[PDB]
């Protein structure tokens, strides 16, 4: 057999120019898109201010329009999903990740407008969903769209253009290219059988988008924790501990998200209007909390910097944790178009921080700075729920810039999966596919 | 479908027995990577309490500054030709092959051979890295336990082998993230799904990095300091630089390859026509390492100096070529030592120069050569060894200039994008193929 390999080696890294060139067109498109989405989202969360402030005198009139808006939109969201693209609803990565193994279609001529405008409402309203996930999906479709519009055929160019579309997407989302790759090839990628995804193809894609994103988002990051202190080897074990905690709570949060999404099915049975109505319901709810305690609502990003600094008191932390631990489930589990990738970071950050403060006072001789713990854990609730450590560790670094904490960040995320494993749980992203894959059949 | 649905629900489940072993492995690799690195220096040191002792009589210097690097270089080749022919050279082509099960892991041989062996080639002053050598010393370590504990099952043979490499690659550059991205972008059997447990590797990598930090704390291997940044209007410049690496990438490959043939004739396969040719190039190096060190040795030390802009356009090109030579002549000579590390130096040096040119070319981009000296520190990896992602990240891992990530990629990418469209192949795979085909028949 060694006769073949010897020929396969000498025939490596040869990816058709036609493919590479397309991954470029794709990567590019994804970017422009990821941008406009992100742009549109804000623009609305904005209007929802030139609303409140206009009626900032009559308190009940506020709390009122601070519900209606996030309700009218959230609904509009669910609608554009239940009536045009049931596949959109929820993250959207379980699908792309499945569509890779060829177990789900990529109805882009549907999903795109649906997921786009759709989440524009859910997110542009104030719900507890990220916009990253939604993009990963919006991305792949973009890849597909070209694949179809140029009918270049051949597995390679169907799994490749699909994968890069994702990566490009994930990247332009956090302005993090390295993550967008490590991701596709640690998670999305068909987990059990060699595949025709051209790594290099992805890169060009990722890049092309990050550039596109930098074209409209330069001079400002999404987070800016600033160089935190360092971490001595005698304080390493502390990050392991924090890791283990994430490890036990990782699968749990997974049960909830999962089951909770069932217990939320009863309320509407599958009825477009029992949903849309329940939609603007949680939606409006959020928009309200987003003007009575915003750290419980919205993306959650904005409170990461504040959290890492140590501006939240042990009290305000725990409160914010729980509150979100709830708004998050109730929003994602409700099949609304939006993801739980981003908001998971927030929880991570917040949980980590707290662990820090405890540590700080526990041993003042380690000269700790909660901020570091608020980082060893920013992506740990990713290394337990979504079990994609390597993608997290790197996504964090990618946008937190504290490589000095690489040793801790790993020892945590590792310890994370090391307990998210030894205690049930599974890739919250895989489980979703499986279910939505088994429910596909087992129903005929 | 039904299968998949059961496969998903059965993911990330790696036997506690495996994980626990990857740990013992990782650990061992570290302590090892350390003592190696420690010993190497110790020698490059003695070769000072030698020269200085005879720093009065010039020719007496240039003399003992050859004999030492000769006596050792030989001792190296010897412990290889007579005890482990598989060691000689990098050592990665093997491990990478041993993964697909096309080469054996004669650890009870390789370990002492490669170790003490390269301790001489390197500890003398040859143009070979110590990284590669360790990747190999690593896998074996992984093997050794596999055997000593006869835990059987592909998974625990491909896993403990892989992590052993990673752990090794890591403790080498104190770069964990690299040690992983590497195994799963290169070493990994390139064409068929495998039973290597990612998580298994991590625990391994970590365990070694910790082990390395235990004895190497408070000091990095490189310290370029936060360089400036890079505006989107100076991006294309890094593409250009990338394309240059992309054309010279395969070329340097031809040479390394062929040159290792043209170096075969001199000894035919004779243990003594080698050993003699060994301390020949060996002694040569040790000499240059006291008449122009930037042409000899690991080459690390001159990366910082290079990135700063301390070398003039003259001294750069000279240092490039000189090394472009000493490197081939040393690695291609099947001496136990790798070309991973020294390839960085070339990259850095080539990059820098490109910088200075740029700087004066357009002073309106307010460039700083230093950044180009980095978009390319690992670009001659993204062409020779065609492992961009592992490079990009190994650089960052120990350069700390994430602000340059956009450039660093656009180069390395542009690198393989030409190393491709112009012949060339994974200098690491080609070696295996050859050393695999030269096997059957």
């Amino acid at each position: 057999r060694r006769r073949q390999l010897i020929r396969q080696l000498l025939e490596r890294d040869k990816t058709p120019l036609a493919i590479l060139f397309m991954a470029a067109v794709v990567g590019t498109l994804v970017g422009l898109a990821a941008v406009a989405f992100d742009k549109g989202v804000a623009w609305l969360q904005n209007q929802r201010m030139g609303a409140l402030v206009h009626t900032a005198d009559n308190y009940p009139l506020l709390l009122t329009v601070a519900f209606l808006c996030s309700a009218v939109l959230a609904m509009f969201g669910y609608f554009l999903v239940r009536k045009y693209a049931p596949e959109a609803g929820g993250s959207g990565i379980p699908e792309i990740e499945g569509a890779l193994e060829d177990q789900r279609p990529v109805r882009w001529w549907r999903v795109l407008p649906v997921k786009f405008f759709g989440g524009l409402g859910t997110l542009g309203g104030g719900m507890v969903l990220g916009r990253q996930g939604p993009t990963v999906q919006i991305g792949g479709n973009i890849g597909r769209m070209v694949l179809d519009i140029f009918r270049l055929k051949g597995d390679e160019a169907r799994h490749t253009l699909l994968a890069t579309g994702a990566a490009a997407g994930l990247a332009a989302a956090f302005n993090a290219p390295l993550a967008g790759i490590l991701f596709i090839i640690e998670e999305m990628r068909p987990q059990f059988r060699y595949t025709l995804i051209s790594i290099k193809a992805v890169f060009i894609g990722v890049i092309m988008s990050t550039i596109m994103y930098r074209i409209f988002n330069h001079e400002v990051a999404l987070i800016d924790v600033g160089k935190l202190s360092d971490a001595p080897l005698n304080t390493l074990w502390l990050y392991l501990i924090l890791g283990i905690i994430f490890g036990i709570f990782g699968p749990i949060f997974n049960k909830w998200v999962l089951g909770m999404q069932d217990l939320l099915h009863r309320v509407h049975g599958g009825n477009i209007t029992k949903w849309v109505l329940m939609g603007g319901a949680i939606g409006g709810l959020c928009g309200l909390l987003g003007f009575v305690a915003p750290a419980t609502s919205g993306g959650g990003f904005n409170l990461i910097p504040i959290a890492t600094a140590g501006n939240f008191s042990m009290g305000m932390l725990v409160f914010i944790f729980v509150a979100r631990v709830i708004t998050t489930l109730l929003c994602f589990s409700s099949g609304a178009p939006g993801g739980i990738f981003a908001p998971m970071l927030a929880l991570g950050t917040v949980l980590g921080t707290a662990f820090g403060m405890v540590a700080v006072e526990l041993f003042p001789q380690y000269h700790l700075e909660a901020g570091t713990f608020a980082i060893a854990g920013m992506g740990a609730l990713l290394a337990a729920s979504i079990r994609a450590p390597l993608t997290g560790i790197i996504l964090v670094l990618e946008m937190t810039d504290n490589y000095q904490l690489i040793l801790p960040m790993i020892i945590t995320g590792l310890g994370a999966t090391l307990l998210a494993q030894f205690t049930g749980g599974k890739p919250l992203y895989s489980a979703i596919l499986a279910r939505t894959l088994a429910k596909q059949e087992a129903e005929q | 479908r039904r299968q998949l649905i059961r496969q998903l629900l059965e993911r990330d489940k790696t036997p506690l027995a495996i994980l626990f072993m990857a740990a013992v492995v990782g650990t061992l690799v570290g302590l090892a990577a350390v003592a190696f690195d420690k010993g190497v220096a110790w020698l490059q040191n003695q070769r000072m309490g030698a020269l200085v002792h005879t720093a009065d009589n010039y020719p007496l210097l240039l003399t003992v500054a050859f004999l030492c690097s000769a006596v050792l270089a030989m001792f190296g080749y010897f412990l290889v030709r007579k005890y482990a022919p598989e060691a000689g050279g990098s050592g990665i082509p093997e491990i990478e092959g041993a993964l697909e099960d096309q080469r054996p892991v004669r650890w009870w041989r390789v370990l002492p051979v490669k170790f003490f062996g390269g301790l001489g080639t390197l500890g003398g002053g040859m143009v070979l890295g110590r990284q590669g050598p360790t990747v190999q010393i690593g896998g074996n370590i992984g093997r050794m336990v596999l055997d000593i504990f006869r835990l059987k099952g592909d998974e625990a043979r491909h896993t403990l082998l892989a992590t052993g490499a990673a752990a090794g690659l890591a403790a080498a550059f104190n770069a964990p993230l690299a040690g992983i991205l590497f195994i799963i972008e290169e070493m990994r059997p390139q064409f068929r799904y495998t039973l290597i447990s990612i998580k298994a590797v991590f625990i391994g990598v970590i365990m070694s990095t910790i082990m390395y930090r235990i004895f190497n704390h408070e000091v990095a291997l490189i310290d370029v300091g936060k360089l400036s940044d890079a505006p989107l209007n100076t991006l294309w410049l890094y593409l250009i630089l990338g394309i240059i690496f992309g054309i010279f990438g395969p070329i340097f490959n031809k040479w390394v390859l062929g040159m290792q043939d043209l170096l075969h004739r001199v000894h035919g396969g004779n243990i003594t026509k080698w050993v003699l040719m060994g301390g020949a190039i060996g002694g040569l190096c040790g000499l240059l390492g006291f008449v122009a060190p930037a042409t000899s040795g690991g080459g690390f030390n001159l990366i910082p100096i290079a990135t700063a802009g301390n070398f003039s356009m003259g001294m750069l090109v000279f240092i490039f070529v000189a090394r472009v030579i000493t490197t081939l002549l040393c690695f291609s000579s099947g001496a136990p030592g790798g070309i991973f590390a020294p390839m960085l130096a070339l990259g850095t040096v080539l990059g820098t120069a490109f910088g200075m040119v740029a700087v004066e070319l357009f002073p309106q981009y307010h460039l700083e050569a230093g950044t180009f000296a980095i978009a390319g520190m690992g670009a001659l990896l993204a062409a020779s060894i065609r492992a961009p992602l592992t490079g990009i990240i190994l650089v960052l891992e120990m350069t700390d200039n994430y602000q340059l990530i956009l450039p660093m990629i656009i180069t390395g990418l542009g690198a393989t994008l030409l190393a491709q469209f112009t012949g060339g192949k994974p200098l690491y795979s080609a070696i295996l193929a050859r050393t695999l085909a030269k096997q059957e028949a």
Partner: antibody, heavy 120, light 107 residues
Framework: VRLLESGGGLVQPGGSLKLSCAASGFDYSRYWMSWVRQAPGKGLKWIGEINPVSSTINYTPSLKDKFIISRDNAKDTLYLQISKVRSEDTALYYC??????????????WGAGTTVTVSS | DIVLTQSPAIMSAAPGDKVTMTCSASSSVSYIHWYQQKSGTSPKRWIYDTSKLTSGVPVRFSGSGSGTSYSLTINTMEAEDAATYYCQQWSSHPQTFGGGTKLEILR
């Protein structure tokens, strides 16, 4: 972010004056500092620019050492030495902080000013 | 070195009016900048990269142009816009400023 430059004043033809510019409210390093002068009534004319590590320093088309820009990052201060001054050198001297958008650098935060009058 | 020459040397218009000032380059430039200088103050970075208002610039202001000729505009100018605007380029070393345009308000 305050850019306060002192030094200016009265100097007799063929003289020399060391204009100073103390920075505060930001990281002096990572920053390219420059000077630009405005002649009473007239417009602005770029003098020089000196990168962080001061490993680069350029000036407008003006001879040998009419100008000598330097900086002591240890004191976050920018300097400017004008020698053999002449009436054409009487103007308002500003020290700006340099940055860029897409990359075609701009004069970010201009300091106060300091005036140099050449006269006997 | 590039010779930027701002068209109206001096101009006056009554607030709420639409005013536009030009800035031509002898050769070719790209991503021009604009600085606003009110009496008694050092210049202030107004518009940049041809049309990126700076953090704080009223959305009243707008940048434009291309290669050989650029401009800066004020849709409905207000009285607090009285000042001297300076276009500057650095798309070709050494950088160069314009002759300036002095806006004056009619009341």
């Amino acid at each position: 972010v305050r850019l306060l430059e002192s030094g200016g004043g009265l100097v007799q033809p063929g003289g020399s004056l060391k204009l100073s510019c103390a920075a505060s409210g930001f990281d002096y390093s990572r920053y390219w500092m420059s000077w630009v002068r405005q002649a009473p009534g007239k417009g602005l004319k770029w003098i020089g620019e000196i990168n962080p590590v001061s490993s680069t320093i350029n000036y407008t088309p003006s001879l040998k050492d009419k100008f000598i820009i330097s900086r002591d990052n240890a004191k976050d201060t920018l300097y400017l030495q004008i020698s053999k001054v002449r009436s054409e050198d009487t103007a308002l001297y500003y020290c700006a902080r340099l940055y860029y958008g897409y990359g075609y650098w701009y004069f970010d935060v201009w300091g106060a000013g300091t005036t140099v009058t050449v006269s006997s | 070195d590039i010779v930027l020459t701002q068209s109206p040397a001096i101009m006056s218009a009554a607030p709420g009016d639409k005013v536009t000032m030009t800035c031509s380059a002898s050769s070719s430039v790209s991503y021009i900048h604009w600085y606003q200088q009110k009496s008694g103050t050092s210049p202030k970075r107004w518009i940049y990269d041809t049309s990126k208002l700076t953090s704080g610039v009223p959305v009243r202001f707008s940048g434009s142009g291309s290669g050989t000729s650029y401009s800066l505009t004020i849709n409905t100018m207000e009285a607090e816009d009285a000042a001297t605007y300076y276009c500057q380029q650095w798309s070709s070393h050494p950088q160069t400023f314009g002759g300036g345009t002095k806006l004056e308000i009619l009341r």
